[PDB]
């Protein structure tokens, strides 16, 4: 039985669900691991061979780093710092090449789709740029004028959002509980009427409104946490939550292993 999940709604990159029979600390830790501890693939190193755009090499490198990359098979990929390799071997990194240049009177727009994978993925669907716009162009990177040649290589390593936000698989993770002020955790700031000033939350409909007749429940504890997870696009929300749970469990197991060893 334990804790159960009630998915109010699901989407391609957005899932809203409810967690029950779970402690507040556990939910907060789950949110923290999901926002920070989930491994993800993103561009880490940028090597410039011929750049003449109005922008700067550091600027374009930073923009490229934030570009989402497919990370469904991230678990198969290994950290570069772990595997014994000279530098960015195919077993721990994904190599892409960006090439572009302008022409007579048409500005050249660089998008995510322009990136071309050059390393051998060994049949792994990892490192592919994420495209979600209706037009399908992708994330705009820069603009090149006539005579402006852009030519660079990008190496993406496995990493977590803690080292850099570019690896963040989830954009916004909404977490709420106790819509009606049942636990007295928050003292609403009011000038005329607390109820009127503060609009009722959307989740309020899923819990019985409080009755003034009954007294305050001092034995009540936080429960029925409404959590909405949105994915940038690198990993689907379901896989995002699954990987967050896996990372938290792995960290707890590592703590247990350290305790046993010591």
């Amino acid at each position: 039985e334990g804790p159960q999940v009630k998915i109010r709604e699901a989407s391609k990159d957005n899932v809203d669900f409810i967690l029950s029979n779970v402690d507040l600390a556990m939910a907060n830790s789950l949110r923290r691991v999901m926002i920070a501890e989930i491994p993800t693939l993103a561009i880490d190193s940028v090597e410039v061979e011929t750049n003449t755009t109005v922008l700067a090499d550091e600027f374009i490198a930073h923009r490229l780093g934030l570009i989402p990359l497919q990370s469904m098979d991230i678990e198969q990929l290994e950290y570069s710092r772990d595997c014994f390799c000279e530098d960015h071997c195919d077993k721990c990194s994904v190599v892409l090449t960006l090439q572009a240049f302008g022409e007579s009177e048409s500005t050249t727009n660089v998008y995510s789709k322009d990136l071309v994978i050059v390393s051998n993925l060994m049949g792994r669907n990892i490192g592919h740029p994420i495209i979600q716009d209706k037009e399908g162009n992708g994330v705009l990177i820069c603009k090149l004028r006539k005579g402006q040649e852009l030519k660079l290589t990008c190496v993406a390593k496995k990493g977590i959002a803690k080292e850099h936000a570019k690896w963040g698989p989830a954009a916004a993770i909404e977490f709420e509980y106790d819509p009606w002020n049942k636990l007295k955790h928050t003292d609403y700031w009011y000038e005329q009427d607390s109820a009127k000033e503060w609009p009722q939350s959307k989740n309020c409909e899923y819990e019985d409104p409080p009755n003034e007749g009954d007294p305050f429940d001092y034995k009540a504890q936080a429960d029925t946490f409404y959590m909405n997870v949105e994915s940038v696009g690198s990993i689907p929300v379901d896989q995002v939550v699954v990987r967050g749970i896996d990372t938290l469990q792995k960290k707890v197991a590592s703590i247990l292993l350290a305790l046993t060893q010591m």
């Binding site: 402690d23 749970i245 703590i255």
Partner: protein, 114 residues
């Protein structure tokens, strides 16, 4: 010019133990466990699990400074109960709860067509 090593926050340094357990003289049967390269995420959950156990008496987690990825957990239990055993039981319970939550989420996702 001297910003901290970002990777060092979650990576153990050379000659550094993940956990450092020492006795506490403030109260009987009290221990201090220093967790290195860890944040509130694990400390708060472990402490909350420990407090849910009747035998455990005191369980408090403290972060000395945001600069250093490290915290200290003070655990005091009843006589004849080793704090390490209580921590192991709490970790096992956390793992079981996480596995149950994962299974429930997977089942719910499979049930829903979307």
């Amino acid at each position: 010019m001297n910003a901290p090593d970002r990777f060092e926050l979650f990576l153990l340094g050379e000659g550094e133990s993940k956990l450092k357990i020492d006795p506490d003289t403030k109260a009987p049967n009290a221990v201090v466990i220093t967790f290195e390269k860890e944040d509130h995420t694990l400390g708060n959950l472990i402490r909350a699990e420990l407090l849910n156990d009747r035998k455990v008496l005191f369980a408090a987690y403290k972060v000395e400074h945001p600069f250093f990825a490290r915290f200290k957990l003070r655990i005091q239990t009843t006589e004849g109960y080793d704090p390490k055993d209580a921590l192991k039981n709490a970790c096992n319970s956390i793992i079981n709860k996480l596995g149950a939550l994962k299974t429930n989420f997977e089942t719910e996702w499979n049930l829903q067509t979307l």
